[model samples]
Target: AADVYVPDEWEVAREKITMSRELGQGSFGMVYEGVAKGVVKDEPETRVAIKTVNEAASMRERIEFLNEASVMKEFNCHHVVRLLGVVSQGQPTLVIMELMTRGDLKSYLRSLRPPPSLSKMIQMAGEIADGMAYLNANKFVHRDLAARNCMVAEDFTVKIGDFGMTRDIYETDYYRKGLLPVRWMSPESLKDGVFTTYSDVWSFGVVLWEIATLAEQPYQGLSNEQVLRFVMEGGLLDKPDNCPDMLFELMRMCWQYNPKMRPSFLEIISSIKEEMEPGFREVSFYYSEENK
Candidate 1:
């Protein structure tokens, strides 16, 4: 039987892709920046990011690696990373995706000298909400949604990435005994390991906080166990410096104790758009005296 794992429509010739250099190293394998010739009908070559599945991986891991493409193919939106195709005919099957030169949003936000302006961060948040709305409408639950999982293009177009990849590239302080995005997890997720669009909304709140604070680590001073306890005990993220009151209010709803109380992605988009409208001259910050 033929090993036509990848659909013909999503297959790229092995000869067409030339791996340039390593872009990143994931838990499973390395990702590279490459040029794929004859990709678009009118274009001679297209720059692409190639994710490889190490041949030494187990059968299940290899399948999961390729499955990332399968999950990405159905997403037809500008705010989501575009899957170019797969190079499965050769060894180390490649999952080729769009090249986002600016890289992940977390790193990009942290690298900015003065940090992005409030409006700019709101714009990015709106884009993420737009993408998440599309996914939510389609019944897709992004178990892992964080600043690092979102990519920033050369033009600063923020797009969601690494849905099925689920690979955690955590820093020393961010991880626990087991690698988990504990800081971003909703209380329900941390308590029972349950994930849904609702939990994703909670993570979206954390992401919004990240954008507002220029990608500051969530719960910076707390350990993972303490973060779990903090969230479970009804504590929420502090309002970022200069974060608009409207945005922080939205984040609070996203972190609602009951998942049902959280605003839908559609609602989030509307809130942001309303704030961006003309005649909205005043921008207030969130301030309250510390409770004993």
Candidate 2:
């Protein structure tokens, strides 16, 4: 791959620059909002999201960073975060994306501060599943599926982000060796480092857990090794406060020990949409609180 272009001094024209300190950090990077410049001098400034790699401690890490940028450039889905472009200057790489004013799902939940309404939870879960379905249809697996990676726009549109760990199903062998994030990984993935569509289902279960809990960190009391061990022993997350039985059942299916038993992303999207149909009216009202 070509070396990504990075600006030497990181300068944006004064009139075209605006930075919002409401940025959030991820395990691999940090995201911020800024104004984008146009080719013509008189063109209106465009709102852009800037995500820069927070850690590039090794060649493999840098390659993954570049791969994510490359993948984002190829994706074109309203449900997927738009990758505007990239900047590779200084030591770390930076990717410019569409600015999502509402930030991530985790931040949204934190700001809402608790007692997640059933409707809000369902809407969030549906949107996330929709995004995952899109990726799955395109033969990609969002390995790091979680509330923190879902970005919400001003209009309440949800888009999946943080593609650094996303993998294309068509290109690589499934049996790659590495330690995935234990909290979000599926059993097969955790046990053998093998990733497949089935594994993605497992990760989505964790995402559901995050949504149901209003974005609490997973396996809060356990270390990664311990969490892995517990998962092997059939341990799953405790049901979030007030989660309905139906939704909890769905989560259990996704987290099933047998990968073959896990539902496909497409199945998940359809099932959740169906399950929430009767309650859409309620959910619509909950998300109506724009800030919440």
Candidate 3:
């Protein structure tokens, strides 16, 4: 998602952006690697990610895109994708943002044999929790939070990316129709359409499991039907063998049955930092394809 939407009135002329190779598409539209020249002052050129949405085709799409653009316009955090600028007064509406060198966390981990050590993964977890806390403080509820939704910088800094436009009590009136990441979704979001900061907390727990296990597909081999039933019956994902117990306990806290029982994002970061003390070893524990 980059959800990296820029503010209005910053109309990037057709000449400012140079669309490069196509990276693919997502729920928004086509994604690409591009460059923006003379963005501000003599800043030379800036590389960016571009996500285009069909602003003219669907009125609903326009509403949702604009809603997020407004929400993302002012966000400036180290652990969240930074919005560069947006182009709407043209053919395909584009949301521009900083390019993540390492790409999405899940895919980044997959390309590695033995992924980063436990300490490094826990460090990434803390950064993500910190970013989510910033969003939580700003009155933004990221309906989507998972390893795939996170982006890693060239220097190994993890940033929370993407946002979900699913059903909402007030934010949206229309319901999204399609396949969803049911495995990362909370029981509340599954049984009912109750999504909130706590639901994101639940998803964050799944994300921790994702990184520690080197990208094991959640609820692997289970049908969506099976996952829904299993979760509804109070089944929680078992911790990966390599996942630290302290982190697992934190994830357990995030998976609290009642949203109120879940720890706030601030509390989450605190617990993560406690485990991130100078002691966590550098065991690069991960499951490779051959081992799997």
- Stretches of candidate 2 off by over 4 Å are 2-30, 38-43, 53-63, 88-93, 163-179, 275-292
Model 1 per-residue lDDT tens digits across residues 135-159? 7877789888999889989978788
Per-candidate Cα RMSD to the true structure, in Å, reads 7.6, 8.1, 8.7
Question: Per-prediction count of colliding residue pairs?
Answer: 0, 3, 0
Model 1 spans > 4 angstroms off? 1-7, 163-179, 275-292
Model 3: per-residue Cα lDDT over 182-277, one tens digit each: 888889898876678989899998988888788787777777778888988888888887777877887799888887999987777656556553
Any residue pairs clashing in model 2, and if so which? 5-88, 6-88, 6-89
Give one digit per residue, the lDDT tens place, for model 2 in 1-292. 5444333333333444455653655335665767777622476777787666766456566666666666655666656777665555454566667778877676677777737567666766776776676677667876767666788889776678853333321112122334356688876677777778788778878877877777777888777777778888888999988888877998999988989888876577567665554544343322223212
lDDT agreement with native, every candidate: 0.78, 0.66, 0.72
lDDT, residue 134, model 1: 75
Clashes of 1: 0
TM-score for each predicted model, relative to the true structure: 0.87, 0.74, 0.82
Ranking by lDDT: 1, 3, 2
